[PDB]
Write a protein that binds this DNA or RNA. Sequence first.
DNA 1: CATAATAACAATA
DNA 2: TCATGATATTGTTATTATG
DNA 3: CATAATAACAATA
DNA 4: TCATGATATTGTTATTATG
Lengths: 319, 319
Amino acid sequence: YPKTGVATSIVEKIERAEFNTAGRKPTVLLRIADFIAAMNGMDAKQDMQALWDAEIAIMNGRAQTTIISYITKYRNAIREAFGDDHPMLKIATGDAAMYDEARRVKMEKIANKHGALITFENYRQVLKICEDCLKSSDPLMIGIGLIGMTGRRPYEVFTQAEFSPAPYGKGVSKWSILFNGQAKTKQGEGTKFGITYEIPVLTRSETVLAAYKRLRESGQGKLWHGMSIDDFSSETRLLLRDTVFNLFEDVWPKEELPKPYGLRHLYAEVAYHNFAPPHVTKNSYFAAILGHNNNDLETSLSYMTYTLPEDRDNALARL
Amino acid sequence: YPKTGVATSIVEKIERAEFNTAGRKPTVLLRIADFIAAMNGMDAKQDMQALWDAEIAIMNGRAQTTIISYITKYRNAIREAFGDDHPMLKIATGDAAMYDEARRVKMEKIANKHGALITFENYRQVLKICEDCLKSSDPLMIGIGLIGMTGRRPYEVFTQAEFSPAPYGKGVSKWSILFNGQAKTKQGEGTKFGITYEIPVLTRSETVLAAYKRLRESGQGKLWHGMSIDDFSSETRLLLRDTVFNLFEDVWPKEELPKPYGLRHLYAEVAYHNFAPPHVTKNSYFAAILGHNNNDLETSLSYMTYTLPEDRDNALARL
DNA sequence: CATAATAACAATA
DNA sequence: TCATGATATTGTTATTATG
DNA sequence: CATAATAACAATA
DNA sequence: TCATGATATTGTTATTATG
């Protein structure tokens, strides 16, 4: 197995921070860089164990989700520098109790939300705002409009979505399109990786499909295209966050702050309410429109957080 | 650790089959009996491994679910004969790939049902039959009535349910009762083991609570009380199956045979439709009324197989 | 001259 | 189902003994 | 004399 | 989220350099 190599992506990010005008030092990227270099020439399992144990010691005071996230970075560096069959990958992982506890915490939150859904009272107003955004000249605003109307992830809308018209028999479908460029698949066998599938939209098909060409053909739109997740996060995340805060501040449900992924949840909740055939369940429909892995009905649970005021009203009428 | 002991329950079942008038020989119970005895005095891990490997060889041609079920019997015998800390329990288990494949098969079936729900057209008729059963003099029929009206498992209805009136403020609740005696909990920490919780009923509270006293105070009803699962299965399973087949043959949905657990599914589907507050999801409500483990929303997925004709009709009306 | 009884066999939650 | 490696339930059919 | 920028820090699906 | 031991996304805040 290889005992020499370099995590190119980490080094390049460090070298760019060399001549920055302001901001934190890349202390974490640095530790990963040094960690990888100290591994060059290492062939003893007990040596590799001592090196990892040291990094783990530093991370001590961090939150559990943080350490879990930080472990992924080290692991991805090792794969980049040494490949997938390096013995370090058996050592540099979280403990089993760490992942078991994270899973437990995760499900507890989802379970708490399923028992206390938030009534999205002004949801039609939120949808209207999103619709108006589709006609904005700021391609950022156009993207936000598309998130609400297509339910696609921000990274998908801005960097890699392929929106095409869906056939309806011999005509073109009015309340659905075709989408390609599903993110997060990890290239799984039963995923939507590289697969074009049909999705519902919350406004006219022609309106959505035209607003996306304006997004694609704009200036910022061509910078965005094909971008890595890290570049997108650094270029657009904080501005999109602030923009979404402001657009929705007064109409979004008081229980929570307005958030980009709030639009993805709402999209599912509204699209089920409007388009779901009677022979499918909510879990199955959610999984279908959100592009989830084959036979997975569990991920859908995460997205169920809202209740439409119309459904609320008559569940209160069923005495 | 103990190296001597006997699985009493297995021996007793074999000794009873000694003077039977008809029926199969207990070949499986016999192998388990011999297996346990051959273990007396064994202290070598390689010996224990060879003994298990032989039992596994016999089971070869059986179905996967069968072998998994048969492994539980051997494992329970070992625990009964030698206790929970016997090294055989590390050896006598299915392979990891066996359980992974069973899980996969399990979810695939649930996923197929969520995408092709059965319309329970004559569900009100089924509920009426169940209601009429509550007034039958055959305590078997009364039990069937209670399954449909309370959604409790057959083993719970017949052997160990404790039905009590639920308070509504200062009065007594009309469409709910209190239930104790949840089965299958494996005495888990977050389960309903030994816990009395409130459940909805599909007919008047007074009607259900009176039909159960007639069940309890009957003759067959006192034989049933406190019974083990194996005795219940042998005493009542095949008769209840046949009785349920006949009662519902012509009104039950054509897609499937009428089955006792069909009433438990229907109970959930009908009780959500009628009594569920608007701030809870279907998964959460199902989990609550069916008595599931804390924070578990995944088990509910199993019970979602039907769609009410009333919901079907207007999901077809939402164009 | 065949059918009730039993436990194996199997699947579901 | 509780737990995430399995168990406890429910559901189906091949054997057996028997005037 | 303080605020824009950056990556750490963190959480969600 | 895909897989069931983790990764790839989204979301929040402490540091830093700077006339």
